[PDB]
Amino acid sequence: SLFVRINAAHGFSLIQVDNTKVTMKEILLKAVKRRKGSQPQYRLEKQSEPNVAVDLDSTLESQSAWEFCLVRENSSR
Amino acid sequence: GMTEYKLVVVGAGGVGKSALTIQLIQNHFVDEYDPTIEDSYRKQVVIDGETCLLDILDTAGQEEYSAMRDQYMRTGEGFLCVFAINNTKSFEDIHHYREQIKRVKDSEDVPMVLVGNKCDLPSRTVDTKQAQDLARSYGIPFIETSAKTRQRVEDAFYTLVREIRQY
Numbered sequence A: 001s002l003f004v005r006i007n008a009a010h011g012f013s014l015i016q017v018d019n020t021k022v023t024m025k026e027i028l029l030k031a032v033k034r035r036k037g038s039q040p041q042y043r044l045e046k047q048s049e050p051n052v053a054v055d056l057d058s059t060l061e062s063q064s065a066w067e068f069c070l071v072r073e074n075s076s077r
Numbered sequence B: 001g002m003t004e005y006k007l008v009v010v011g012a013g014g015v016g017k018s019a020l021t022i023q024l025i026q027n028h029f030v031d032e033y034d035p036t037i038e039d040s041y042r043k044q045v046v047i048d049g050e051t052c053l054l055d056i057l058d059t060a061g062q063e064e065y066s067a068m069r070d071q072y073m074r075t076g077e078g079f080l081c082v083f084a085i086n087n088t089k090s091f092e093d094i095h096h097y098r099e100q101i102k103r104v105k106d107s108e109d110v111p112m113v114l115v116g117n118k119c120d121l122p123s124r125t126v127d128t129k130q131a132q133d134l135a136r137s138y139g140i141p142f143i144e145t146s147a148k149t150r151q152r153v154e155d156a157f158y159t160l161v162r163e164i165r166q167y
């Protein structure tokens, strides 16, 4: 199965994806619900591009990456 | 500014590995069954008066991800081997987890606890002395837990840290 690695403040989560047309928004929502519970605002960053939020409406395919950092908006990775 | 302990939760699919982990970390019971690939959670706790960092690895019960076991078994410092008291197949499955951990550790003793989870449920198909005797054959404690009611959840994880500290 395909999955992405999400690095967060207190550990990592592997998030299953059906395909690379999934949006980055869907991945973030799954990561936040698992690691934080029911709902602070969060962003995802490409592993190799720190301090820049990925466009959550874009597809996983458009990111050309399989590892992301989950960061609270007022914080850094 | 404190010691970290790397704990690993293993066992068949659906026994409650994730529910146990999230009850410990977040004081919350997960009702949904979202199968795990792999997730880690770090939390500062006080155990026997000593502050430390727990690094808990929540692993896959689904056989599709069985290749991952080699990696995490080598560096894990203590293992919760979890079955569900209403699922004798998950009790059978404990042996394959214990045997793979043993092989990767070259047959050393490893901090480990046999955990019988879902003890809140009325249906019980694993017998108590049966579970105690499996634990005794491995030389490890047996602890009955419920991720739903939090029964003995801290006991199970904290026993690993007590053992890692002594070994």
Ligand SMILES: Nc1nc2c(ncn2[C@@H]2O[C@H](COP(=O)(O)OP(=O)(O)NP(=O)(O)O)[C@@H](O)[C@H]2O)c(=O)[nH]1
Pocket (backbone or CB within 6 Å): B011, B012, B013, B014, B015, B016, B017, B018, B019, B020, B030, B031, B032, B033, B034, B035, B036, B037, B059, B060, B061, B062, B117, B118, B119, B120, B121, B145, B146, B147, B148, B149
């Ligand atoms: N009644 C009860 N249900 C529990 C308990 N622990 C887990 N469950 C339930 O059992 C189901 C599976 O739990 P989960 O923690 O996802 O199991 P898992 O071992 O992590 N599964 P996987 O190996 O696929 O990741 C969920 O519906 C969960 O609510 C418990 O102690 N009591």
Ligand SMILES: [Mg+2]
Pocket (backbone or CB within 6 Å): B017, B018, B019, B034, B035, B036, B058, B059
């Ligand atoms: Mg799980």
